[PDB]
Design a protein around this nucleic acid. Sequence first.
DNA 1: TTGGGTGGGTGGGTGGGT
Length: 191
Amino acid sequence: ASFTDEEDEFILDVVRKNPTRRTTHTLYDEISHYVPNHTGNSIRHRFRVYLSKRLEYVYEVDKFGKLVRDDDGNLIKTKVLPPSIKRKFSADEDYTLAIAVKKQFYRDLFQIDPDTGRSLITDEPNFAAYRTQSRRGPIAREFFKHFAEEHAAHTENAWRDRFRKFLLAYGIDDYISYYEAEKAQNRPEPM
DNA sequence: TTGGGTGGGTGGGTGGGT
Ligand SMILES: [K+]
Ligand SMILES: [K+]
Ligand SMILES: [K+]
Ligand SMILES: [K+]
Ligand SMILES: [K+]
Ligand code: NA
Ligand code: NA
Ligand code: NA
Ligand code: NA
Ligand code: NA
Ligand code: NA
Ligand code: NA
Ligand code: NA
Ligand code: NA
Ligand code: NA
Ligand code: NA
């Protein structure tokens, strides 16, 4: 659906009051709760392609991102954007995403559960010695929605682009082997 | 190995890249 002048100014006012959370997914999810028929990603695109063009200014915040006020308790306008504070991805989080995506490729390919070897109900090779190769595969939206429920540190959205932008570029097999090698008397760094 | 920003944001972000 479309955005009214009201929805547009509200989205702008919230981003100006939250400078450090402008590149997150969560801020737009929080905004969407107050905007009828719009998802968080719908609000995020609306800001990235249109509203960010006329941000004009943001409000002043401290090192923690909380709003700073004058001696009258009024907000202070500014044109200096503060650092985009975003939750980072650990090598462990990156691994679990590589393992989980390999497990889903396996299921979809061999119709055998990777964990037990049991057969699956649909509409043999070793998992460890299985290679996803160049497969980007078909992944349902439900995979990331369920994967965020298990790993709520990052949102389903955030997990989705970690796989498309980093995981698929670094290589699933490539990162799994890398993570394991460093695990033996070493510590692995995230993509 | 099937997109770009001179197509445009009143087309929309579950269509996808950026
Ligand atoms: K393309
Ligand atoms: K189009
Ligand atoms: K388009
Ligand atoms: K577009
Ligand atoms: K880019
Ligand atoms: Na829209
Ligand atoms: Na987005
Ligand atoms: Na966009
Ligand atoms: Na865009
Ligand atoms: Na074009
Ligand atoms: Na264009
Ligand atoms: Na244009
Ligand atoms: Na248009
Ligand atoms: Na539009
Ligand atoms: Na596309
Ligand atoms: Na997209």
